[PDB]
C-alpha cells in the first residue's frame, strides 16, 4: 500500500494563523479564542536580538504598538502580557474558526506536523520529530517564526510547538505554547550548542516493521539478541537504549508481522554493524527514525 | 534554513471530500459545485472488478443507488453519468465550500500534494511526483480511492489526480479529473506492468542545487561536461536526457549558487559513476528526483 511521511490535514490550523507586526519586525501569530500567541522577539530590532532584555523592551510597548491582521482585517489589541518566551495579545474579537484545542508539551522522539507560514499566510505542511536533543529538522526561512506544530486527535488540535530560531547546524528550536523552550536554548542571537543528537531507537524499529509490512525483508536474519546485548550496540552508535516499555509499544507491529522485537533488534544490530551494502529500505538508503510506532500503525 | 518535502495546505481540499457508497463498495468523492466526482469502480462488486463491463454495470444503477454523505448530511443524487473512468453524480446542493478550482492534466516529472482520505474523511497530506512511467509512490490503503492530488496557485486549486489502483510493484495509478488514466493502465483487477521507470534528471539537479544552497558541497568537483556527453551517461543510468529547456528552468538556481548547469551535470555524473561513498546529501543517501525546480525555488 506504500509508506510515506504524512502530515496531518492542516485546515483547522490554517484558520488560526495571523500576522503580527511590531515596528518593522513581522512574524506569525496563533489566534485562538480572544488571544494571539507569537514569539516575544517580535518586539526586538535587529540590534536588540544580540542581547535583549525582554522585560525592559516590552515595557516600552503598548497595546497600539502591536498590529495584528487576519487576512485583510485588522484586530484591535486590548491587552498584552509575556509568558516565558511568548507574547499573548488579547484582542477584542474571538476567532470564529477556533477549533477544539489543547496545549501539550511533547516528549522527545514524538512527531508532529508543522504548518509553515509567512506573513500569516500558510505556505506548506510537513511532519517533524522532536529530536532527543530537543531540536527539529524543518524548513524555516525568515519570517517563519510563529509557525506552529500540532497533532490532531479526532477533532481536537494539540498544539505543541512554536518556531523561534535556527541553530548553526541547520536545525531549528522553539517553544511549547506556554513559551517554554524545548531544550537548553534561549531567544538571543548568540552561538548555542544543541549537543550530541541520539537516534530514536524505537522509531527505527517501528520503521523497520513498516518495511516488512510493505514486503521489504532482505535485512531480516537468523539471529536474535537480548535487551542488554542490543543496548551495548545501541550505546556505541549513539542510539537510545531500548526498554521494555519500547518493546510493549512495538507490540501491535510485532504481532502483525510475527517478528519478535528482539529478532528485529538483531537485524538492526547487523544493519548498524555491517551497513546496508548499497540496498534501500522503503525507498531510503538510511535508517529512518522520525516515524513513531503510532505513526506506523496509522498507515499500515 | 532547511529543506523538506512539503505539501500544500489542504484546507481548501478538505471541504470538498465526501463519501460515496454503492452497495458495500465505499470510496471518496470530490464535491465541487453541484457535482460529485469519484472512481467509476464504486459500482463494482469484488467479482465485477475481475473483468468489468462498466457500461453494462452502470445501466443497472439509478440515482437512488448512490449514497453520498458529506459528514453526516445525505446529499440527494439527481443525476449520474460516466466520463471515461470517473462518475459524475449531480446533486441537489452546491458545495458551499467550493474553492476557486480548475482541472489540469499534469505532465510527467511534476509534483503535487495528495490528501489521503478514508470514508470521506481526510487522513493525511503528502507530496508526490508523477513518475515518467505515469505512476506515483504514495500511501493508499483500501478505501483510499477517490483521494485527489492537487496544486495551489494563490487561491486556486488545480486538481490533477484521482486515485484508482495499486500496481504489483507497490506503486499507484490514477486518472485526471476527466477520468483519463495517466499511463497505459485500466481499471480492472488484472496484472498490469508500468514499464521501466526513468529518473527525472532536471529534478535531481534542482535538488543538488538545493543542497548547495543549504551548505552541502562535498559532491562538487572541478570538472565540467557537455549536454551530449552527460546524456550519454544519463541514458546508461535510466536518467531522462537533459535539454536546453531544462537548463533554462534551472536558471534561477544556477544564478543563486553561481554553479553553471553543465558544471552541476559533471558532479552528478561523478555521483552516478562513483556513488556517494557512504556520505549523505540533504539527509539522504540516495539521489532525490521528486523536487521540481519550482519546488526548490519556493523553499529557498
UniProtKB/Swiss-Prot annotation, chains A, B:
All ranges on the Cytoplasmic side of the membrane: 1-300
Domain of life: Viruses
Active site per UniProt: 41, 145
Assembly, per entry: 3CL-PRO exists as monomer and homodimer. Only the homodimer shows catalytic activity. Interacts with host FBXO22; this interaction promotes the proteasomal degradation of nsp5.
Name of the protein: 3C-like proteinase nsp5
Reactions the enzyme catalyzes: TSAVLQ-|-SGFRK-NH2 and SGVTFQ-|-GKFKK the two peptides corresponding to the two self-cleavage sites of the SARS 3C-like proteinase are the two most reactive peptide substrates. The enzyme exhibits a strong preference for substrates containing Gln at P1 position and Leu at P2 position
Signal peptide interval: none
Glycyl lysine isopeptide (Lys-Gly) (interchain with G-Cter in ubiquitin), cross-linked positions: 5, 90
Location in the cell: Host cytoplasm; Host Golgi apparatus; Host nucleus
Activity regulation annotation text: Inhibited by pyridone-containing alpha-ketoamides compounds 13a and 13b. In turn, alpha-ketoamide 13b (tert-butyl (1-((S)-1-(((S)-4-(benzylamino)-3,4-dioxo-1-((S)-2-oxopyrrolidin-3-yl)butan-2-yl)amino)-3-cyclopropyl-1-oxopropan-2-yl)-2-oxo-1,2-dihydropyridin-3-yl)carbamate) inhibits SARS-CoV-2 replication in human lung cells. Inhibited ex vivo by michael acceptor inhibitor N3. Inhibited ex vivo by compound 11a and 11b.
Function recorded in the entry: Cleaves the C-terminus of replicase polyprotein at 11 sites. Recognizes substrates containing the core sequence [ILMVF]-Q-|-[SGACN]. Cleaves and inactivates human TRMT1, preventing tRNA guanine(26)-dimethylation of tRNAs. May cleave human NLRP1 in lung epithelial cells, thereby activating the NLRP1 inflammasome pathway. May cleave human GSDMD, triggering alternative GSDME-mediated epithelial cell death upon activation of the NLRP1 inflammasome, which may enhance the release interleukins 1B, 6, 16 and 18. Also able to bind an ADP-ribose-1''-phosphate (ADRP).
Domain Peptidase C30, first and last residues per copy: 1-300
Amino acid at each position: 500500500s506504500g509508506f510515506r511521511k504524512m502530515a496531518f490535514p492542516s485546515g483547522k490550523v490554517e484558520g488560526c494563523m495571523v500576522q503580527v507586526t511590531c515596528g518593522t519586525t513581522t512574524l506569525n501569530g496563533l489566534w485562538l479564542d480572544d488571544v494571539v500567541y507569537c514569539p516575544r522577539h517580535v518586539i526586538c530590532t535587529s540590534e536588540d536580538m544580540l542581547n535583549p532584555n525582554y522585560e525592559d523592551l516590552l515595557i516600552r510597548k503598548s497595546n497600539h504598538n502591536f498590529l495584528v491582521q487576519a487576512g485583510n482585517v485588522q484586530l484591535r489589541v486590548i491587552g498584552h502580557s509575556m509568558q516565558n518566551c511568548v507574547l499573548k495579545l488579547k484582542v477584542d474579537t474571538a476567532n470564529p474558526k477556533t477549533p477544539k484545542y489543547k496545549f501539550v508539551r511533547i516528549q522527545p522522539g514524538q512527531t508532529f506536523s508543522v504548518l509553515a507560514c509567512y506573513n500569516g499566510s500558510p505556505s506548506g505542511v510537513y511532519q517533524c520529530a522532536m529530536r532527543p536533543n530537543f531540536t527539529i529538522k524543518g524548513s524555516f526561512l525568515n519570517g517563519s517564526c510563529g509557525s506552529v506544530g500540532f497533532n490532531i486527535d479526532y477533532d481536537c488540535v494539540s498544539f505543541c510547538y512554536m518556531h523561534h530560531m535556527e541553530l548553526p547546524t541547520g536545525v531549528h528550536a522553539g517553544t511549547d505554547l506556554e513559551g517554554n523552550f524545548y531544550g537548553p536554548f534561549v531567544d538571543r542571537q548568540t552561538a548555542q550548542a544543541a549537543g550530541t543528537d541520539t537516534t530514536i531507537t524505537v522509531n527505527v524499529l517501528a520503521w523497520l516493521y513498516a518495511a516488512v509490512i510493505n514486503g521489504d525483508r532482505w535485512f531480516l536474519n537468523r539471529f536474535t539478541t537480548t535487551l542488554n546485548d542490543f543496548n551495548l550496540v545501541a550505546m556505541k552508535y549513539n542510539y537510545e537504549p531500548l526498554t521494555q516499555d519500547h518493546v510493549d509499544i512495538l507490540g501491535p507491529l510485532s504481532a502483525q508481522t510475527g517478528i519478535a522485537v528482539l529478532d528485529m533488534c538483531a537485524s538492526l544490530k547487523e544493519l548498524l554493524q555491517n551497513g546496508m551494502n548499497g540496498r534501500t529500505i522503503l525507498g531510503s538508503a538510511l535508517l529512518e527514525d522520525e516515524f513513531t510506532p503510532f505513526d506506523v500503525v496509522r498507515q499500515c
